Write a protein that binds this ligand. Structure first.
Ligand SMILES: [Zn+2]
Length: 69
């Protein structure tokens, strides 16, 4: 594990946002670019409203759990 230090000039300090589909059967958390907020986003947002083509559908599965042992 590693602590995400916030202040070091070295390293990527980009943010990360997640949006949950509006449909119940979905309820999946899609990944957006990074300059998007839920406050400005619509209430009926869905996977089809995703920026990542890799996960811009309601049929695409959620990002599998990653993590080295
Ligand atoms: Zn969906």
């Amino acid at each position: 594990g590693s602590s995400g230090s916030s202040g070091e000039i070295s390293g990527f300090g980009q943010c990360l946002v997640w949006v949950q589909c509006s449909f119940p059967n979905c309820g999946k958390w899609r990944r957006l670019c990074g300059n998007i907020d839920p406050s400005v986003l619509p209430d009926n947002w869905s996977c089809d409203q995703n920026t990542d083509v890799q996960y811009n559908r309601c049929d695409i599965p959620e990002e599998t759990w990653t993590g080295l042992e």
